[PDB]
């Protein structure tokens, strides 16, 4: 319910207040016109009012359509595109394309169709048309939106109205951005408590990762600020409950998921993992309770405080980190490891979704750490009748104790893993675009969470503490903020030239 007082603060500035931003922002084509939604929108507006870029604009939009069309409609759409843009006497013929690119796009019917064409289209728009844009009013209007994006949007802008859950350092609240009305989760981390338990590194790591990655399969950070008592992270609201609750607490009589449901989540998790691994992040804490459902029933990975980020030229890390019963053998043996650890945990996760128990312990079995370690290292997992051959086999490939022999991330992707018979009926293209109907959709009228019921001493803050807080409170994330402006109509309202 948009609070008008804060809505009134979303106004475009005079141009003289954008001079500093002009001289300081990364003016990269890819960053500005493809990844930042307002920048893309304004660039397309520029292309739309400049006749000579009409073909490039239209083709670009029509490839995106093709890329997210239903299977049955793709042949027809392929035909329309080739007729509109690739036949030489067509009104919207794209004469800027090399004839080789064109000829190649007029042939074939493969999965890659129109991807080299898109590259070509985007390569072209990154040259002259981009330059022309930078020299247009449309770019100046972008600077106006970036100015507004940089303006203080701290605690007062958010109305907390419910507790979604509890973490180690504070609660997570459902909240509302007052100006726009958009709902988010706000993870609150208590400052004194954080300092006391030396949680800076994990807190900062989660925030840096949630800020830099932009995946539909990982919770997105929109805002990061501090208050007198907390550090706060405002991120994607995930109202559907976590996988653990859904495994055990939704329908207690029949714990676990039917196979198709378990496969769907695995595919979504695999996609989130791939997105991390491509950017050299090892997650190190995949488990059912960290995979959250949204209202549509799509899942995302969360809780990134144990993650590690490999630096340039570093292919392995080391260290005892994670949740017991999800930590790979190579990790437990004190060896170097890479992304492999996450695929082992994916295996335990899949195992648990089908079997409604972990593969190394009986129900309610509470063991010494060393006993659990020896089971992970030495004990072969057994699979009950519930497992189909495909599920058994996939789990066996993931729970492989030797990381060399384990299914996972090879050649910069999970494509190998995607060919496994278990995903026989998944359209990966549609999964990645979010077009699939999830097999389970949470009831809006249900709270899918265990029930909720509501100072540490002798902690004074030195300079190094407040310096860490100010680093952490980096503020507004461009991409999510721009999504918000667009989604909620504010961009529409404010981006006007004449009514």
366 near Cl ion (CB under 5 A): yes
> Scanning residues 121 to 150, which ones bind its own copies (CB under 8 A)?
132, 135-137, 140-141
d(CA 113, CA 93): 18
Task: Report the half-sphere exposure of 205 (CA within 13 A, side-chain side).
Answer: 17
Residue 104's contacts (CB-CB under 8 Å, 6 or more residues apart) are 116, 117
Give the tokens for residue 269. Answer: 């998790």
Does 166 count as an annotated binding residue?
yes
242, 285, 294, 342: the active-site residue: 285
Q: 39 or 288: whose CB is closer to ligand ADP?
A: 288
Indicate the residue among 55 and 305 with the shorter CB distance to ligand ADP: 305
- The answer to whether 288 and 256 are in contact (CB under 8 A) is no
- Judged by CB under 5 A, the stretch of 30-38, 213-221, 298-306, 457-465 that binds Mg ion is 298-306
Give dist(CA 401, CA 291) in Å, integer: 24
We find the least distance from the C-beta atom of residue 45 to its own copies, in angstroms, to be 5
Partner interacting with residue 127 (select from Cl ion, its own copies, Mg ion, none; CB below 5-8 Å by kind)? none
Tokens of 15: 């141009």
Residue with tokens 């001493």: 457
CB of 351 to ligand ADP, least distance (A): 21
Segment lying near its own copies (by CB under 8 A), choices 42-50, 213-221, 252-260, 344-352: 42-50
Is 364 part of any known ligand binding site? Answer: no
499 binds its own copies (CB under 8 A): yes
Q: Estimate to the nearest angstrom the gap between the alpha carbon of 294 and the chain centroid.
A: 13
Q: Is residue 303 near Mg ion by the rule CB under 5 A?
A: yes
Contact 338, 328 (CB under 8 A): no
Q: Candidates 292, 301, 332, 436: give the one binding ligand ADP (CB under 6 A).
A: 292
Binding residue count for ligand ADP, defined by CB under 6 A = 19
Minimum CB–partner distance for residue 63 and its own copies (Å): 22
Which is closer to Cl ion, CB of 38 or CB of 105? 105
In degrees rounded to 5, what are phi and psi of residue 361? -135, 145
**Is residue 229 involved in binding its own copies (CB under 8 A)?**
no
Q: Out of 360, 383, 468, 472, point to the residue binding Cl ion (CB under 5 A).
A: 360
| Residue labelled with tokens 């408590």 | 193
**Contact (CB, 8 A) for 269 and 217:** yes
* Interatomic CA distance for residues 41 and 22, integer angstroms: 19
User: Quick one: which segment of 106-114, 235-243, 343-351, 479-487 binds ligand ADP (CB under 6 A)?
Assistant: 235-243
Adjacent-strand bridge partners of 410: 413
Annotated ligand binding at 237? The verdict is: yes
DSSP class of residue 289 equals G
Q: Is 285 a catalytic residue?
A: yes
- Determine whether the annotation assigns residue 322 to a binding site: no
Q: Which of 39, 55, 129, 165 binds ligand ADP (CB under 6 A)?
A: 165
Is residue 45 at the binding interface for its own copies, with CB under 8 A as the rule?
Answer: yes
Could you identify the residue written with the tokens 């260290």?
Answer: 319
Q: Does 168 bind ligand ADP (CB under 6 A)?
A: yes
Q: What is the smallest separation between the CB atom of 167 and ligand ADP, expressed in angstroms?
A: 2
48 binds, among ligand ADP, Cl ion, its own copies, none (CB under 5 to 8 A by kind): its own copies
Does 188 bind its own copies (CB under 8 A)? Our answer is no
Residue 256 annotated as part of some ligand binding site: no
- Binding mask 184-203 toward ligand ADP (x if CB under 6 A, else -) reads -x-x----------------
What does the alpha-carbon distance between residue 244 and residue 490 come to, in Å, rounded to a whole number?
37
Beta-ladder partners of 224: 233, 475
CA distance 254 to 241: 18
366 binds, among Mg ion, its own copies, Cl ion, none (CB under 5 to 8 A by kind): Cl ion
3-state secondary structure of 158: strand
Q: Does 117 bind Cl ion (CB under 5 A)?
A: yes
By the rule CB under 5 A, 48 interacts with Cl ion: no
DSSP class of residue 140 equals H
Q: By the 8 A CB rule, do 387 and 354 touch?
A: yes
- Let me know: does 172 contact 302? Beta carbons within 8 Å: no
CA distances from 221 to 128, 215, 272, 365 (A): 34, 11, 15, 37
Between CA 402 and CA 351 the distance in angstroms is: 18
By a kind-dependent CB cut-off of 5 to 8 A, residue 496 interacts, out of Mg ion, Cl ion, its own copies, none, with its own copies
| Residue that the structure tokens 């007729």 belong to | 83
Which amino acids are annotated as binding site, given as ranges?
A: 164-172, 187, 236-238, 303
What residues are labeled active site? 285
| Residues at the site binding its own copies, with contacts judged by CB under 8 A | 14-16, 45, 48-49, 132, 135-137, 140-141, 496-499
| Residues at the site binding ligand ADP, with contacts judged by CB under 6 A | 164-169, 172, 185, 187, 219, 235-238, 242, 292, 302-303, 305
Which amino acids are annotated as binding site for ATP, given as ranges?
A: 164-172, 187, 236-238, 303
């Amino acid at each position: 319910s948009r609070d008008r007082k804060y809505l009134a603060r979303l106004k475009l500035p005079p141009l003289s207040k954008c001079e500093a931003l002009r001289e300081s922002l990364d003016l990269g084509f890819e960053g500005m016109c493809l990844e930042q939604p307002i920048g893309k929108r304004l660039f397309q507006q520029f292309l739309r009012t400049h006749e000579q870029h009409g073909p490039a604009l239209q083709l670009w939009k029509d490839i995106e359509d093709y890329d997210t069309a239903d299977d049955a409609l793709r042949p027809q759409k392929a035909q329309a595109l080739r007729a509109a843009y690739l036949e030489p006497q067509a009104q919207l013929f794209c004469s800027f394309l090399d004839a080789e690119t064109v000829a190649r796009a007029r042939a074939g019917a493969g999965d890659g169709l129109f991807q080299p064409l898109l590259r070509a289209v985007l390569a072209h728009l990154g040259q002259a048309p981009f330059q022309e844009f930078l020299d247009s009013l449309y770019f100046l209007r972008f600077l106006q939106w970036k100015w507004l994006e940089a303006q203080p949007m701290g605690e007062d802008w958010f109305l907390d109205f419910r507790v979604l859950g509890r973490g180690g350092f504070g609660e997570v609240f459902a909240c509302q951005m007052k100006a726009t009305g958009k709902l988010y989760a706000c993870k609150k981390l208590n400052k004194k408590r954080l300092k006391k338990r030396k949680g800076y590194q994990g807190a900062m790591v989660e925030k840096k990762i949630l800020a830099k990655v932009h995946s539909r399969f990982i919770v997105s950070l929109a805002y990061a600020f501090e208050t007198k008592t907390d550090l706060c992270l405002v991120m994607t609201i995930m109202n559907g409950g976590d996988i653990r609750y859904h495994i055990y607490n939704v329908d207690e009589d029949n714990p676990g998921f039917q196979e198709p449901r378990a496969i769907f989540y695995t595919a979504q998790i695999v996609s989130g993992l791939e997105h991390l691994h491509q950017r050299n992040i090892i997650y190190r804490d995949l488990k059912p309770e960290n995979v959250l459902l949204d209202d549509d029933g799509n899942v995302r990975i969360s809780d990134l405080g144990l993650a590690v980020e490999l630096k340039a030229g570093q292919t392995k890390t080391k260290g005892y980190a994670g949740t017991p019963g999800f930590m790979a053998p190579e990790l437990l043996l004190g060896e170097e490891y890479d992304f492999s650890v996450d695929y082992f945990a994916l295996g335990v996760t899949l195992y648990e979704m089908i079997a409604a128990r972990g593969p190394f312990r009986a129900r309610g079995e509470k063991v010494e750490n060393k006993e659990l370690k020896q089971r992970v290292l030495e004990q072969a997992v057994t699979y009950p009748d519930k497992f189909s051959p495909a599920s058994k086999d996939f789990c066996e490939a993931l729970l492989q104790k030797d990381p060399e022999k384990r299914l996972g991330f090879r050649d910069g992707s999970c494509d190998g893993l995607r060919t496994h018979p278990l995903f026989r009926d998944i359209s990966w293209r549609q999964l990645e675009a979010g077009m699939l109907t999830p097999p389970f959709v949470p009831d809006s009228r249900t709270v899918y969470a265990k029930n909720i019921q509501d100072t540490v001493k002798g902690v004074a803050f030195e300079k190094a503490d407040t310096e860490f807080f100010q680093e952490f409170a980096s503020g507004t994330c461009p991409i999510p903020w721009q999504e918000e402006m667009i989604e909620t109509g504010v961009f529409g309202d404010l981006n006007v030239w004449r009514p």
